[PDB]
């Protein structure tokens, strides 16, 4: 049962961190892992593979960490690494971290991602708040009769707090695709038609599960490249990592500054 | 084999109803179940869970009924409850009722659904004939080399009969999504671009399977809400049920009136 | 492991053909199988079902052949028949032939398909070069962290060579859908919005796997019908086969002429 696995994981988290409730959770994936060093100093570091329900039996050798980090007056669970849908496992693994974090007390989920920029104004290394999303995966993490409204899924209140940290922050619509291939130029022209400003390979199911669980969500993209066809140059995964490493200090300091306002 | 399970189910239906052929079938899901009481008086009521192939081993406790109802001069199989794709089981469960109904003699399938209204003209409680659909599930119920043309999938002849019952009936294009989450406002703007007038979580596979089996299809949506982003208010599943209960008499009397014209 | 199965298949191919490296591969599916007789004279003909990894245990009775054909100065592996995604098996079966062909030495993949024409200029029996694609399947054949850029997926260099064979060849964007049902007219209007010129049921995963493996790709569609809603007439699978048989000589001679330029 997903709820039961989430409660079991939250109990292990409380026991191993010695902290009974974490009120905020942050998910870092590719593009954002370097930012951990500027975000804060963990008081507990746990391998995801040691926690119930996090890592598929299939491969345990590539999973990241769960961190307990004090940020302002909060106790923050930081997921340092995602198991992406493109690994080919059930979505329960994608959204179990959100569900476990909620069961541990998290009222707010900060979901970070890397993205390709579709919109005219965007630059490599630019953070962009997610105002809404397009789920283009043809999937949902909700199974059976679990209904959730996604109006204001990306909390307006939390985007306002982020704009206090940086009043020039852009905001835009994120298209979540399966991956792991990059899009063709024709696909990017299609996404422009569909109203996407950003394109990536994560996040949409985490947002849905978070809202279904009653948590508020803040989404932040790092633009790692302009999308296929815009510059004419080929894309490469090296760009994602390079942008993450280059932006690390700024991005960690931004997240810490915003979370302290919660 | 799906054909074999459909023939076995049709034989149980004939045996238990005492009726050798049902010439019409109706599928009622959320939004439409209250209409049964105005549609007619069943002569046989069977739990779906007692019929071969209807209900996944996984959960038998939420499935509805199969009714045998005389409507005009017809003998009508009424599926009172669907197993939706969002329950997470193979599509064979979604379309097995259509295939079983065909094997029982059904020449016409009336597929009802609840929908969110995308178009400017629509109101809560309004019935809308389905003129065409957009299958946005990335799935098909047809497996292997079973080809079907979907031109005039929603029989023009049957829509004309429905307009005899009510000459002011609107018609529009239904977008079938996986569900079970509601759409974001950005998703609804996308669906408007794609040409959808109605959005829901059923029907498209039933229509495909019906056409592949050689049955004519009439589709009828009940608008239960305007789609996300139109009013600015959040959506809720309570709206679907409330609209169904409020419209019950009108909707049952409409279906009976149209089916009598077949 | 897909790589291991591809290497095992390539070793069987080398052993049974007596040819240590095939430098070009061609995939023929519905619409194109008749063209084999004009393409060349195979030196070895193997059932796909005898080769590691080609055919699912589920059904071995419908799979085609693998041919070794000398075309110009090349040694060409010709896949005479595809196992389509709509058969319902893992994508590894879809893309295993490309991966096996690469492991056998193939530097260039020629991927043929049948398609419905969405664009104003197109005629039944017309070959059209694929300039780009839209993958509308919500799937990828790449599993885990295998990243590939799809800029110039359909090699500009190879399309130029094809235009030497026939300077009037049209080019357009191919939309790959799951199938096996045809599209509704509303779906076709949607695909026009999304920028598709051609619509079919194959190819996109083969292209992705080919690019990930480091092969160049040439894509060629045969227009077998105008898409749903354009003429108003219903579509039928008979049209695909009839167009394939009628175009056989021209299409085989075209492929041979282009491959000799590689
Ligand atoms: C190319 O390989 C990857 C692998 C993983 C991710 C997401 C990781 P996350 O931080 O969400 O956990 C991305 S995201 C990404 C940046 N630019 C593009 C692009 O142009 N198209 C589509 N997607 C992306 C790209
Ligand atoms: C919100 O929960 C549900 C659950 C089930 C159904 C379908 C049942 P059926 O009668 O087809 O068997 C719907 S349908 C529906 C009404 N308004 C919307 C909307 O705005 N978006 C998308 N879909 C719907 C909604
Ligand atoms: C109708 O049945 C089939 C079965 C198989 C294929 C593809 C075989 P391939 O050569 O790629 O291996 C097609 S392709 C096709 C032609 N016209 C249409 C159309 O109008 N819509 C969508 N698709 C097609 C159609
Ligand atoms: Cl990650
Ligand atoms: Cl990273
Ligand atoms: Cl760039
Ligand atoms: Cl129902
Ligand atoms: Cl109801
Ligand atoms: Cl409303
Ligand atoms: Cl084939
Ligand atoms: Cl053929
Ligand atoms: Cl035609
Ligand atoms: Na995740
Ligand atoms: Na059903
Ligand atoms: Na294939």
Domain coordinates in residue numbering, chain A: 1-262
Among chain A residues, the shortest Cα distance to B83 is held by A144
Tell me the C-alpha to C-alpha distance, in Å, between residue B131 and each of A73, B127, B214, C141, C193.
Answer: 57, 13, 18, 35, 19
Q: What share of chain B is helix, strand, coil (3-state, %, to 5)?
A: 35, 25, 40
Which residues of B make up each annotated binding site for a purine D-ribonucleoside?
183, 225
User: Is residue A248 within 8 Å of residue A34, measured between CB atoms?
Assistant: yes
Give the Cα separation of B151 and B148 in Å (integer): 9
Q: Are strands A65-71 and A44-47 parallel, antiparallel or unpaired?
A: antiparallel
Q: What's the token pair of residue B254?
A: 């409409």
Give the Cα separation of A56 and C144 in Å (integer): 13
Give the Cα separation of C133 and A187 in Å (integer): 7
Q: What is the rounded radius of gyration, in angstroms, for the C-alpha atoms of chain B?
A: 17
SS3 of residue A220 by DSSP: strand
CB contact under 8 Å between C186 and B208, yes or no, is no
Among B114, B127, B172, which is best to mutate for testing ligand 2, by the most ligand atoms less than 8 A from CB? B114
Name the burial class of residue C241, with classes exposed (0-12), middle (13-18) and buried (19+) by CB atoms within 10 angstroms of its CB.
Answer: middle
Show residues of chain C in contact with A232, CB under 8 Å: 151
* Residue A208 touches chain B, beta carbons under 8 Å: yes
User: With breaks defined as C to next N over 2.5 Å, after which residues does chain A break?
Assistant: none
Pick from A181, A192, A195 the residue to mutate for testing the C interface (most C CBs within 10 Å): A181
CA-based nearest distance B221→chain A, Å: 19
Resolution (Å units) = 1.6
Q: What is the rounded radius of gyration, in angstroms, for the C-alpha atoms of chain A?
A: 17
Give the Cα separation of A154 and A178 in Å (integer): 20
Q: Ligand 4 mean position to A82 CA, how many Å?
A: 4
* Cα-Cα-Cα-Cα dihedral sign, residues C117, C122, C125, C127: negative
SS3 of residue A134 by DSSP: strand
Angle, helices B91-103 vs B2-17, to 10°: value is: 50
Method: X-ray
List the 164-203 stretch of C: residues with Cβ below 8 A of B. 178-187, 189-190, 193
Give the Cα separation of B188 and B32 in Å (integer): 24
List phi, psi (to 5°) of A211. -65, -40
Q: Please count the other Cβ atoms lying within 10 Å of the Cβ belonging to residue C214.
A: 9
Residue with tokens 């599926």: B79
Show residues of chain C in contact with B145, CB under 8 Å: 86, 180, 237
B202, B205, B210, B251: which one is catalytic?
A: B202
Q: Ligand 15 mean position to C62 CA, how many Å?
A: 14
Tell me the C-alpha to C-alpha distance, in Å, between residue B181 and each of A144, A153, A209, B187.
Answer: 10, 12, 10, 12
DSSP bridge partners of C154: C217
User: Is residue B63 within 8 Å of residue B81, measured between CB atoms?
Assistant: yes
Tell me the C-alpha to C-alpha distance, in Å, between residue B117 and each of A32, B230, C191.
Answer: 39, 9, 22
Give the Cα separation of C254 and C248 in Å (integer): 10
Is the peptide bond preceding residue A208 cis, with omega within 30 degrees of 0? Answer: no
B201, B213, B215, B256: which one is catalytic?
A: B201
Q: What is the rounded radius of gyration, in angstroms, for the C-alpha atoms of chain C?
A: 17
Q: Are strands B108-117 and B198-200 parallel, antiparallel or unpaired?
A: antiparallel
SS3 of residue A226 by DSSP: strand
Give the Cα separation of B217 and A24 in Å (integer): 51
Give the Cα separation of B178 and B40 in Å (integer): 31
Q: Ligand 12 mean position to C102 CA, how many Å?
A: 36
The region that residue B230 occupies, defined by phi over 0 for left and psi between -120 and 50 for alpha, beta otherwise, is alpha
Ligand 1 atom nearest to CA at A82: 12
Show residues of chain B in contact with C228, CB under 8 Å: 149-151
Among B182, B196, B200, which is best to mutate for testing ligand 2, by the most ligand atoms less than 8 A from CB? B200
CB contact under 8 Å between A184 and C132, yes or no, is yes
């Amino acid at each position: 049962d997903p709820d039961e696995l989430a409660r079991r994981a939250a109990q292990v988290i409380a026991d191993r961190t010695g902290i009974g409730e974490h009120d905020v959770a942050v998910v870092l994936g590719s593009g954002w892992l370097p930012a951990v060093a500027a975000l804060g100093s963990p008081t507990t570091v746990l391998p995801q593979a040691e926690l119930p329900g996090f890592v598929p039996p299939t491969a345990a050798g590539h999973a990241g960490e769960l961190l307990s980090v004090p940020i302002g007056a909060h106790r923050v669970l930081v997921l340092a690494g995602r198991i992406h849908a493109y690994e080919g496992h059930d979505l329960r693994y994608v959204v179990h971290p959100v569900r476990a974090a909620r069961a541990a007390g998290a009222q707010i989920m900060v979901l970070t991602n890397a993205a390709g920029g579709l919109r005219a104004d965007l630059q490599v290394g630019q953070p962009v708040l997610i105002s809404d999303h397009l789920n283009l995966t043809a999937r949902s993490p909700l199974v059976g009769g679990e209904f959730v409204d996604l109006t204001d899924a990306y909390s307006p209140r939390l985007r306002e707090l982020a704009r206090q940290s940086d009043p020039q922050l852009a905001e835009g619509v994120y298209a979540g695709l399966p991956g792991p291939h990059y899009e063709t130029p024709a696909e990017i022209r299609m996404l422009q038609t569909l109203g996407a400003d950003l394109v990536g390979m994560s996040t949409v199911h985490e947002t849905i599960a978070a809202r279904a669980a009653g948590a508020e969500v803040l989404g932040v993209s790092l633009v790692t490249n302009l999308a296929a066809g815009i510059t004419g140059e080929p894309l490469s995964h090296a760009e994602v990592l390079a942008a993450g490493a280059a932006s690390a200090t700024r991005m960690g300091a931004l997240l810490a500054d915003v979370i302290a306002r919660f």
